[PDB]
Amino acid sequence: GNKLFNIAQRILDTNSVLLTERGDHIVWINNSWKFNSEEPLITKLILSIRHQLPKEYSSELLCPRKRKTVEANIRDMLVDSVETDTYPDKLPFKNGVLDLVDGMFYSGDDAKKYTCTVSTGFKFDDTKFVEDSPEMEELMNIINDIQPLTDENKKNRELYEKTLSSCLCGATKGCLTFFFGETATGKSTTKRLLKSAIGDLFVETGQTILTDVLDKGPNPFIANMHLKRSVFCSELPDFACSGSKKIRSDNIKKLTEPCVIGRPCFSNKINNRNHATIIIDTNYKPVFDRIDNALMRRIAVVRFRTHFSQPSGREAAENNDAYDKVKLLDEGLDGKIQNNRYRFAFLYLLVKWYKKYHIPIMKLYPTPEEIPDFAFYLKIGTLLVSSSVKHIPLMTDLSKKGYILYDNVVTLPLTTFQQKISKYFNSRLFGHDIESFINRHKKFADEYLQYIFIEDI
Amino acid sequence: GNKLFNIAQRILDTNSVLLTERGDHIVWINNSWKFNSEEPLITKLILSIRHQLPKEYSSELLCPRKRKTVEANIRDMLVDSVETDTYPDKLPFKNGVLDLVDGMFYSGDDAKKYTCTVSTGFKFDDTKFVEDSPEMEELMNIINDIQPLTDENKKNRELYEKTLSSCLCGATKGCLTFFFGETATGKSTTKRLLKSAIGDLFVETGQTILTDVLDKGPNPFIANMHLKRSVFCSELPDFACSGSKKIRSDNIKKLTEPCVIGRPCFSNKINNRNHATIIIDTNYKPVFDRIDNALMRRIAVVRFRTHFSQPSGREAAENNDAYDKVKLLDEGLDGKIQNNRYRFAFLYLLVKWYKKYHIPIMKLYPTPEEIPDFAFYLKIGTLLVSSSVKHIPLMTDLSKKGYILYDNVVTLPLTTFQQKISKYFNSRLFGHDIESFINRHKKFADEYLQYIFIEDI
Amino acid sequence: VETGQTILTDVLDKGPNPFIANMHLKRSVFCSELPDFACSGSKKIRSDNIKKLTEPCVIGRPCFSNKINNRNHATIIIDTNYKPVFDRIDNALMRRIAVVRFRTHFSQPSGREAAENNDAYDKVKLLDEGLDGKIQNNRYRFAFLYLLVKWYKKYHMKLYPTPEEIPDFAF
DNA sequence: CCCCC
Ligand SMILES: Nc1ncnc2c1ncn2[C@@H]1O[C@H](COP(=O)(O)OP(=O)(O)NP(=O)(O)O)[C@@H](O)[C@H]1O
Ligand SMILES: Nc1ncnc2c1ncn2[C@@H]1O[C@H](COP(=O)(O)OP(=O)(O)NP(=O)(O)O)[C@@H](O)[C@H]1O
Ligand SMILES: [Mg+2]
Ligand SMILES: [Mg+2]
């Protein structure tokens, strides 16, 4: 009774082909879920699975025509969709899934339950996923060189560890991180170590995702981040020189959301799932077009302060205040990392840090005090208090301080506000910021401002 | 004779395949109407419906080639189009349709009468659609935190509810709503809750639909809005720092019409039905290039004024006038909502609000007062009116007031008009607006304005 | 179909524009709610578009199309309250214009006395509220069609210029 | 379609 339909029915009963909500067909081959939009892999699954069927059914699947017929039947059978990539604490490899909470490695049907449609791209080797090894010792020395274990670097080192370990989580993070340092401090070394450790879950993009409009037309540079767990942007075009495009704060806000809008070439899929830790490597501090409390909530900075130099340039490097430590450059490290020598040692370190910093919830917090741009605003937040009903009685002496009440609200005229605020910031140094604050928060009635200096109280 | 033609005739008689006005082919599979432009579903329907046909006819449908022949017959037989999505009070699910007027869930042929070709994408559960539940108390607490039940917030809160309930109606709305507030006020929480509640009827788009030419070319960002009952745009590139493209009033007007123009890749359907409540998440009020009563009549604003902060930054949050209340941030809420914990509780709340605000006709009303960009024009309503032929005798005092009789109609000079305007408002903060108004109302005979102030009478 | 005032102040070729393209075989077009020209500082009425739009063909790219020529059958009527002052006055606009005069006043009883004294309004009547309700019912559909057919038969055909009807065409 | 413009 239509042998080929029966074969398709059995293959469907195995649950090895699924239809996803984006319209892709994912197949379970070699202990991983795979898909290829440009070329479906269903006939590959049919050929591979021919060994699990009766003897008479297997001999039909050696003809490509019959495999195509079975594929047509399977495509007509799949009507409903499924959801994929819903477990944030599972690390998919090419031959199984690693449980980050437990540490157990699963294969076969154990790994199949988590419909992880992405993977590192390499096989998990449990012989190399060990704590004691010469590779581990070399990597420990390298890491302690890049981020020393001193008391002045404790917070910075902890933030470094937490940011690197968050690249294993399949969830949406609320902060973008800047690896900030001078030249030859180990930022690219860390980037390449992470890329080696996490394989295909890592991606590099261009700066257009920070300075251009994401929707526009086709944009693979934003559609390629779909389901990635780490996104790297490098070589910030510093903006001290005139004409440089600033970073769009709305781009930051859009990149911090669970879904990002953008499509590739020849595609109608306009929304991409955002699971990525976004890191920007820079020698210069960022400059944004507009500054507000929404942006100051999504920025963290890690600093690199160890210089690796040739013997000729060491002495001068010792007289630079951008460095706290000067070491000798090792010319064989780049090739060693390019060969994936520290892949599993760094993976073990990342898993250990994930355990360490995953008190029930792992959350990335901002560091607004590390950005000079924000400085002014922070200082303002420590100087002024919004006028409230509790300040009405204080008017008794507020008049002696220059305060004039109006509509039951304490206010200070523009001239008085300028006189009082010139005592905290240099007019030339903080001209644009002070003017912007005045314009943004100035009232009218002759201009008024609803703020009281904490010192007067 | 011609068994396959007879099978196609029977399938056509079942009424499970229809041709829409745009030319879509909609099929009825698994208790829902479905269409996939770039992936026809007629052969899936043939395979699924083979069971209703006689015994001899069903065995022929196991061959993909025979199914393709039957599909060719069926689509040659379909000459007349039908009307779809004409009931705005039916909510379609993956297994039936819910009546919003009464609250009865239909399945099978009962749901088939309403040709609802879109659905939430998930199955309606009767057990979880309950008024009392542990999740309902948490949802009520969250919603009350975001929009407190206080007199000062009464009216605003209602608008909130109304807008949210309007996401259930399958009709065209005449307003665009702006969710306005400072950072960490619950706007994105509300958006995620609504997305969870209404599934696939919710869509997210880019800001291009607000600041670009809708015609252009193949536009998936507009083609994806077809038959959607909720469209969200986020992160307006505000204009505090001037230099960004403004919102086009032409797009605002095109987005309130029953039909929109936009076509996907590899498809020819430039016509999309507009059922969507359009909501914009912003930290800054909008600014448009042109202001006119046509644009001023389709804008509404909802305020968010509750701050959720960590204990470290709470005290400062208590001295900001942008917040009426400060709460404690919960780090588990995001993951709870992302896992669809409050899907059915929020659906029940939305249905209750729909019943409450759907007295015979539900309508969305603009709130032009909130927008400051519209402020000056509004003052013109109380500033001056257009003189009629009834202001002849008044000129007896008009000469005393400054106006000079001319053409038997009250009129004012340019300098006199400027002097009179100076009384209502100061040109220091509105001088450019005064100049624009003078140019707009300029009349030349040596230019005079035939406008009468209300106070003048 | 009705058209706005954008066409009278914008170029045709430009980029993606559906308004001009949808004119294909469309049998009428009215520019309504005109941007009164008395507003100094606003762009004046362009005459190049007036001359071009009357051509037997229409040049312009329909959205998501690849043809820049379309049939032009629409009858062009521009309805406004203010006099037209062309941006540039030449022989083309002088010989390619006309004017229709309306002097019927629909005024409410409250404002009838004030409205009647207006010189512009010659006959003043009481506004009929239900007429709009009768318009949407399409009750005057066949009657209007019959009247239009009668007028077309009686008048048949062309449109003569009215240089005197426009003040700016005086000098 | 994208590119191109
Ligand atoms: N212990 C060490 N750890 C890391 N890198 C080391 C170490 N010893 C030597 N190096 C090398 O010193 C150089 C450090 O610069 P590298 O990390 O490549 O770039 P960067 O300083 O991050 N970026 P840039 O400023 O643009 O040059 C590389 O050649 C490293 O391989
Ligand atoms: N009761 C509560 N109601 C709403 N959000 C809450 C509540 N308790 C904690 N939160 C959290 O507080 C945070 C507020 O952020 P969010 O909901 O995105 O606000 P927002 O106003 O959209 N922020 P922003 O884009 O910066 O202006 C989120 O982590 C919420 O989950
Ligand atoms: Mg480098
Ligand atoms: Mg938000």
Side-chain angles (χ1 to χ4, degrees), chain A residues 1-37 39-214 217-237 239-241 243 245-388 391-393 397 401-402 410-413 417 421-425 427 430-432 434 436-437 440-443 445-446 449 451-457, chain B residues 1-54 56-103 105-136 138-151 153-181 183-214 217-237 239-241 243 245-358 360-378 381 393 402 413 431 445, chain C residues 4 8 10-12 15-18 21 25 27-28 31 33 35 37-39 41 49-50 56 59-60 62-64 66 68-75 77-79 81-85 88 92 97-100 102-103 106-111 113-117 120 122 124 127-133 136-138 141 143 146-148 150-151 154 157 161 163 167 170:
Chain A
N2 229 300
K3 194 194 305 262
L4 291 189
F5 196 79
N6 294 340
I7 297 172
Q9 244 299 312
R10 276 159 193 264
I11 298 174
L12 218 76
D13 288 341
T14 55
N15 274 303
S16 283
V17 197
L18 301 178
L19 172 75
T20 84
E21 314 217 320
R22 317 238 304 181
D24 312 321
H25 288 96
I26 49 160
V27 306
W28 175 257
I29 319 192
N30 283 325
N31 293 305
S32 47
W33 286 105
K34 323 176 52 80
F35 71 101
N36 191 276
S37 297
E39 163 265 309
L41 324 158
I42 305 188
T43 39
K44 285 197 206 183
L45 182 105
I46 297 159
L47 190 47
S48 90
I49 219 171
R50 94 184 171 279
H51 285 308
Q52 284 166 47
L53 311 161
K55 201 271 295 164
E56 68 271 2
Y57 281 5
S58 69
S59 59
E60 291 272 280
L61 299 178
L62 303 187
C63 182
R65 284 191 321 81
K66 297 177 170 169
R67 291 199 303 267
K68 299 252 47 149
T69 299
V70 170
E71 188 212 353
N73 286 328
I74 277 159
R75 282 185 177 255
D76 282 341
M77 280 164 185
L78 286 178
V79 167
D80 290 331
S81 280
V82 299
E83 46 171 19
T84 69
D85 292 283
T86 53
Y87 292 82
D89 40 349
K90 306 289 173 267
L91 195 51
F93 291 81
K94 223 192 54 169
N95 59 323
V97 172
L98 181 70
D99 204 338
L100 283 169
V101 54
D102 217 281
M104 188 101 263
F105 191 71
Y106 304 116
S107 272
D109 275 47
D110 288 308
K112 203 176 163 191
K113 344 185 296 183
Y114 330 103
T115 326
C116 291
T117 55
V118 294
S119 86
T120 64
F122 55 88
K123 295 179 99 226
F124 177 85
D125 205 326
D126 81 59
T127 282
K128 304 186 182 166
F129 190 68
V130 300
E131 155 143 351
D132 301 292
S133 160
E135 280 99 359
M136 183 48 95
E137 278 312 72
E138 312 168 10
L139 175 75
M140 225 72 260
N141 281 331
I142 296 157
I143 295 300
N144 292 347
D145 280 322
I146 295 173
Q147 297 288 341
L149 290 180
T150 72
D151 271 48
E152 286 90 33
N153 202 46
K154 246 204 96 161
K155 267 197 49 180
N156 193 69
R157 162 92 185 222
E158 280 186 321
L159 188 58
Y160 173 85
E161 294 177 335
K162 190 173 155 197
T163 305
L164 283 173
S165 84
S166 95
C167 297
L168 303 183
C169 316
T172 299
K173 293 90 183 199
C175 271
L176 277 81
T177 322
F178 289 89
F179 279 3
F180 166 71
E182 271 284 328
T183 191
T185 48
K187 308 185 299 279
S188 285
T189 299
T190 304
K191 172 177 148 189
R192 296 202 253 288
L193 277 172
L194 175 78
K195 171 172 171 139
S196 179
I198 72 166
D200 274 338
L201 300 167
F202 171 105
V203 79
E204 279 167 53
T205 62
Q207 36 94 45
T208 55
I209 75 155
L210 291 190
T211 60
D212 276 359
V213 86
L214 307 181
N219 198 7
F221 298 97
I222 207 79
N224 270 326
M225 314 180 13
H226 172 79
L227 280 173
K228 292 311 175 99
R229 304 212 178 168
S230 193
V231 165
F232 249 90
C233 213
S234 315
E235 274 98 51
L236 216 58
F239 328 86
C241 45
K245 308 225 280 203
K246 307 259 201 109
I247 305 154
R248 316 178 37 135
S249 318
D250 52 286
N251 275 39
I252 303 293
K253 289 187 104 266
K254 289 178 238 142
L255 284 171
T256 279
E257 283 316 291
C259 272
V260 182
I261 304 293
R263 57 159 188 123
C265 292
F266 314 101
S267 207
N268 291 313
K269 306 160 160 160
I270 57 154
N271 65 333
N272 312 286
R273 186 76 183 87
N274 186 20
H275 283 176
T277 309
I278 298 160
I279 300 147
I280 299 104
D281 253 349
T282 52
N283 286 91
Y284 301 99
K285 295 285 208 200
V287 170
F288 317 89
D289 54 23
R290 196 203 21 243
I291 283 172
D292 54 308
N293 288 346
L295 169 93
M296 298 183 24
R297 231 165 49 95
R298 300 149 152 93
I299 306 285
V301 176
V302 184
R303 44 187 213 270
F304 293 65
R305 290 206 118 232
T306 295
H307 190 226
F308 308 107
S309 59
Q310 321 266 357
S312 93
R314 164 181 281 265
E315 222 265 326
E318 271 151 18
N319 288 276
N320 198 327
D321 84 300
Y323 308 123
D324 282 318
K325 182 179 146 82
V326 188
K327 273 213 60 183
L328 206 73
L329 206 144
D330 182 3
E331 303 191 324
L333 187 56
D334 255 347
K336 271 197 233 177
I337 295 168
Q338 183 84 230
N339 280 332
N340 305 307
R341 164 167 183 96
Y342 308 105
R343 169 175 272 172
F344 289 100
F346 200 52
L347 198 64
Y348 191 86
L349 220 41
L350 289 178
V351 172
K352 203 209 297 231
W353 292 340
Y354 168 106
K355 229 70 59 66
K356 170 180 192 184
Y357 293 107
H358 217 88
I359 59 194
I361 313 175
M362 181 187 278
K363 267 252 276 180
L364 299 185
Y365 302 112
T367 65
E369 71 284 357
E370 304 286 317
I371 287 95
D373 250 8
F374 300 171
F376 172 70
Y377 294 74
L378 273 94
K379 191 63 164 332
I380 273 295
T382 64
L383 295 177
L384 303 172
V385 288
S386 270
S387 46
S388 34
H391 298 127
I392 293 152
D397 61 15
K401 265 93 143 72
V410 176
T411 84
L412 293 181
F417 178 87
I421 202 79
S422 74
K423 184 258 158 286
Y424 288 115
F425 306 105
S427 53
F430 299 106
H432 180 280
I434 275 175
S436 289
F437 178 82
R440 215 195 240 181
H441 288 265
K442 90 168 143 199
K443 217 76 74 55
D446 181 57
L449 282 153
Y451 285 116
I452 304 179
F453 287 98
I454 282 175
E455 66 172 348
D456 303 317
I457 298 185
Chain B
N2 226 286
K3 218 195 256 208
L4 302 188
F5 197 82
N6 296 341
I7 298 172
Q9 252 304 335
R10 308 282 211 106
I11 294 159
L12 219 76
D13 281 341
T14 54
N15 267 294
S16 285
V17 201
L18 310 172
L19 180 81
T20 77
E21 309 285 8
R22 316 200 311 166
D24 301 299
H25 288 275
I26 57 169
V27 305
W28 172 265
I29 308 182
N30 288 338
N31 286 307
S32 285
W33 287 103
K34 276 158 267 256
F35 71 91
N36 214 283
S37 308
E38 78 269 56
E39 196 282 289
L41 324 158
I42 309 193
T43 41
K44 292 200 203 192
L45 177 101
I46 297 161
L47 195 51
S48 80
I49 206 171
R50 88 178 178 278
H51 288 305
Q52 315 177 7
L53 309 172
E56 43 270 16
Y57 285 173
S58 67
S59 69
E60 311 259 307
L61 300 180
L62 302 186
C63 185
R65 190 216 83 65
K66 311 272 204 38
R67 297 202 295 267
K68 263 150 214 144
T69 299
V70 169
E71 200 222 311
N73 279 328
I74 282 186
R75 52 173 49 222
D76 271 354
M77 292 167 150
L78 275 171
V79 289
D80 281 292
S81 282
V82 306
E83 49 163 31
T84 60
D85 294 290
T86 63
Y87 297 78
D89 45 308
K90 304 301 174 265
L91 196 58
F93 288 85
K94 219 183 67 163
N95 53 338
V97 166
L98 180 89
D99 217 342
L100 296 168
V101 317
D102 155 17
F105 188 70
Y106 303 115
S107 155
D109 291 327
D110 305 333
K112 197 180 167 173
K113 326 183 313 184
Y114 332 102
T115 312
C116 301
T117 67
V118 291
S119 78
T120 63
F122 55 86
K123 279 205 221 339
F124 180 84
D125 213 323
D126 170 26
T127 84
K128 307 192 155 183
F129 194 71
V130 289
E131 151 56 30
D132 283 61
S133 166
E135 279 103 24
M136 189 91 238
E138 316 165 18
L139 181 75
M140 278 340 275
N141 278 329
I142 294 159
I143 300 301
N144 295 321
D145 284 347
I146 293 169
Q147 298 284 343
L149 300 165
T150 74
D151 163 78
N153 193 44
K154 212 205 89 145
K155 192 200 165 102
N156 182 65
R157 156 114 190 194
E158 268 151 30
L159 194 50
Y160 182 74
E161 294 171 339
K162 202 155 142 229
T163 312
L164 289 190
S165 73
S166 159
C167 293
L168 294 186
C169 314
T172 306
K173 294 89 187 198
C175 261
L176 272 84
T177 318
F178 289 94
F179 280 7
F180 167 82
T183 201
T185 38
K187 315 182 290 277
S188 267
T189 302
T190 298
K191 166 204 186 134
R192 278 193 261 302
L193 273 170
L194 176 80
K195 171 174 173 149
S196 180
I198 71 166
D200 263 324
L201 298 173
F202 170 102
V203 80
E204 249 177 278
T205 37
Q207 30 190 58
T208 38
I209 77 154
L210 282 192
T211 76
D212 270 37
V213 171
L214 285 177
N219 204 11
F221 302 92
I222 281 283
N224 271 66
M225 283 184 48
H226 167 70
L227 283 180
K228 289 305 157 68
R229 313 207 175 169
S230 189
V231 173
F232 250 88
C233 292
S234 320
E235 273 94 53
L236 262 193
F239 306 90
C241 59
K245 324 150 91 93
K246 310 276 254 311
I247 299 173
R248 309 162 39 115
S249 319
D250 159 38
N251 283 36
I252 296 280
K253 315 212 202 72
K254 302 230 265 204
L255 293 178
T256 323
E257 313 299 277
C259 263
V260 194
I261 295 292
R263 163 186 77 88
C265 286
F266 305 110
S267 191
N268 50 292
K269 325 244 191 220
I270 53 143
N271 287 313
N272 314 286
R273 199 110 60 94
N274 195 40
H275 287 349
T277 317
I278 294 154
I279 301 155
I280 288 96
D281 252 344
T282 50
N283 300 82
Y284 300 94
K285 305 272 223 223
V287 317
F288 316 83
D289 50 26
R290 327 189 296 114
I291 295 88
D292 45 292
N293 288 77
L295 170 90
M296 281 205 18
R297 212 58 215 162
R298 63 189 45 139
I299 306 277
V301 166
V302 188
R303 313 184 307 266
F304 292 75
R305 303 203 109 229
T306 298
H307 188 231
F308 312 100
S309 57
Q310 321 258 335
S312 93
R314 152 188 269 278
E315 166 167 42
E318 302 218 358
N319 285 288
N320 206 329
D321 63 308
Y323 306 128
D324 302 335
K325 180 190 130 84
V326 171
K327 274 272 311 183
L328 201 73
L329 206 147
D330 180 355
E331 312 210 302
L333 194 51
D334 258 358
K336 262 194 250 171
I337 294 171
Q338 170 85 33
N339 271 289
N340 299 314
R341 168 160 178 97
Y342 309 102
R343 162 172 279 173
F344 287 106
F346 198 49
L347 197 58
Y348 185 87
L349 211 42
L350 288 174
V351 172
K352 170 196 268 158
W353 290 341
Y354 169 100
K355 276 182 276 145
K356 168 189 179 194
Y357 295 100
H358 218 108
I361 196 190
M362 187 208 265
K363 192 133 171 313
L364 290 179
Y365 291 133
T367 49
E369 59 277 27
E370 310 273 331
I371 297 89
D373 198 344
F374 296 172
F376 174 61
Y377 294 59
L378 279 201
Chain C
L8 283 91
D10 63 7
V11 161
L12 304 201
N17 178 16
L25 289 130
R27 291 235 186 146
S28 179
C31 167
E33 293 281 271
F37 296 106
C39 304
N49 279 333
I50 279 304
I59 309 298
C63 315
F64 333 100
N66 303 293
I68 52 152
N69 90 77
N70 301 286
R71 303 267 266 299
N72 178 313
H73 287 340
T75 288
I77 272 154
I78 178 174
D79 299 337
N81 304 265
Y82 301 69
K83 76 165 63 168
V85 158
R88 28 170 66 86
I97 218 79
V99 166
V100 166
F102 275 19
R103 45 195 34 250
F106 288 7
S107 206
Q108 315 258 17
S110 160
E113 157 70 321
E116 288 140 350
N117 257 310
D122 165 39
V124 164
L127 204 144
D128 211 341
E129 284 319 310
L131 204 38
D132 294 36
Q136 214 92 17
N137 204 57
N138 250 308
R141 148 182 293 157
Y146 201 83
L147 206 39
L148 280 146
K150 151 191 293 160
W151 278 342
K154 153 183 170 293
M157 158 67 157

